[PDB]
From a paper:
Oxygen activation in all heme enzymes requires the formation of high oxidation states of iron, usually referred to as ferryl heme. Ferryl heme refers broadly to a highly oxidized form of the heme in which the iron is in an oxidation state that is either one equivalent (FeIV, known as Compound II) or two equivalents (formally FeV, known as Compound I) above the resting oxidation state (FeIII). Here, we report 1.06 Å and 1.50 Å crystal structures for Compound II intermediates in cytochrome c peroxidase (CcP) and ascorbate peroxidase (APX), collected using the X‐ray free electron laser at SACLA. The results indicate that the ferryl species is finely tuned across Compound I and Compound II species in closely related peroxidase enzymes.
In a set of parallel experiments, single crystals of Compound II in APX were prepared by reaction with m‐chloroperbenzoic acid, as previously. In this structure (unlike CcP above), the resolution is not high enough to see hydrogen atoms. An electron density map of the distal heme region is shown in Figure 4 B. In this structure, the iron‐oxygen bond length is 1.87 Å (with an error estimate from SHELX of 0.046 Å), and the ESU of the iron and oxygen positions are 0.014 and 0.083 Å respectively. Positive nuclear density has identified an FeIV‐OH species for Compound II in APX, which is in agreement with the longer bond. In the other position (“out”), Arg38 moves away from the ferryl group, and exchanges with a water molecule. This movement of the distal Arg residue is not evident in CcP.
Residue numbers in the entry: 2 to 249
């Protein structure tokens, strides 16, 4: 159950103006995938049992940026700082999650509902909570299930965020896009994953894990066949992720 906090009218006005400015900025800079990854890596540190981590603005801290999993996200933070400065009333936590919602929207994805009121927290979570691309389904459930508190459906739908963007050998070490159209939010991640490896496209071991797991594979098949079902389940999961630890 979520009970969202009240924010002032002025705060609500700034969310709306920031949403529009983020559309223009993220479209022009071609940085939707990185902005989605910043929001995801922000939220994905939540541990439900201790209620630590999650989307509370800490990823901008040099000490969280310096986590190995977060290679390259300093770029994201830097790119957003001038625009954030235009919206002093907004928390960083809300601004980065709004950026992730807008990243999905401006690449043609679902409209993920957005609620303001996240407070910036003073201290980043311990390093080590983000998923490891070399591991498989048990590990995915450890991180998205046992720590974050998301469902198996959420795991597969959120994995579809790889439909935009690419890996970089100087960041993670992996290299290349998952899809032929890495600035378009669609179900291609799943149709690629099914079709086997393609010259010039990437699959992580963690993506492949989806194919061999009895619960994940029917969802991959669903999303490959029905982009609308993918969009519905993605929007549900992204909203949940963006709200972990918030408004509970
Ligand atoms: C399931 C487990 C996860 C693993 C192991 C994983 C791993 C990775 C890796 C290794 C990269 C490449 C980083 C680089 O070299 O630039 C990456 C990027 C990406 N990830 Fe994930 N990922 C996972 C889940 C997610 C989720 C939950 C989403 C958000 C819904 C997400 C969104 C993205 C985006 C959009 C990119 C591309 C970034 C860019 O183009 O710079 N990933 N991920
Ligand atoms: K795509």
């Amino acid at each position: 159950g979520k009970s969202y906090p009240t924010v002032s009218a002025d705060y609500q006005k700034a969310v709306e103006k920031a949403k529009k400015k983020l559309r223009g900025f993220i479209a022009e800079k071609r940085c939707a995938p990185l902005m989605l990854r910043l929001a995801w890596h922000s939220a994905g540190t939540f541990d439900k049992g201790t209620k630590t981590g999650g989307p509370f603005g800490t990823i901008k801290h040099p000490a969280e940026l310096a986590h190995s999993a977060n290679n390259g996200l300093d770029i994201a933070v830097r790119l957003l700082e001038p625009l954030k400065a235009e919206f002093p009333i907004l928390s960083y936590a809300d601004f980065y999650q709004l950026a992730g919602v807008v990243a999905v929207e401006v690449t043609g994805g679902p409209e993920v509902p957005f609620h303001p009121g996240r407070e910036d927290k003073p201290e980043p979570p311990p390093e080590g909570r983000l998923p490891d691309a070399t591991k498989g389904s048990d590990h995915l459930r450890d991180v998205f299930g046992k720590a974050m508190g998301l469902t198996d459906q959420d795991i597969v739908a959120l994995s579809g965020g790889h439909t935009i963007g690419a890996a970089h050998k100087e960041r993670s070490g992996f290299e290349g896009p998952w899809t032929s159209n890495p600035l378009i939010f669609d179900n291609s991640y799943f149709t690629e994953l099914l079709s086997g490896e393609k010259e010039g496209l990437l699959q992580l071991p963690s993506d492949k894990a989806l194919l061999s797991d009895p619960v994940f594979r029917p969802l991959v098949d669903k999303y490959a066949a029905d982009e609308d079902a993918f969009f519905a389940d993605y929007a549900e999961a992204h909203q949940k992720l963006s709200e972990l630890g918030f408004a509970d």
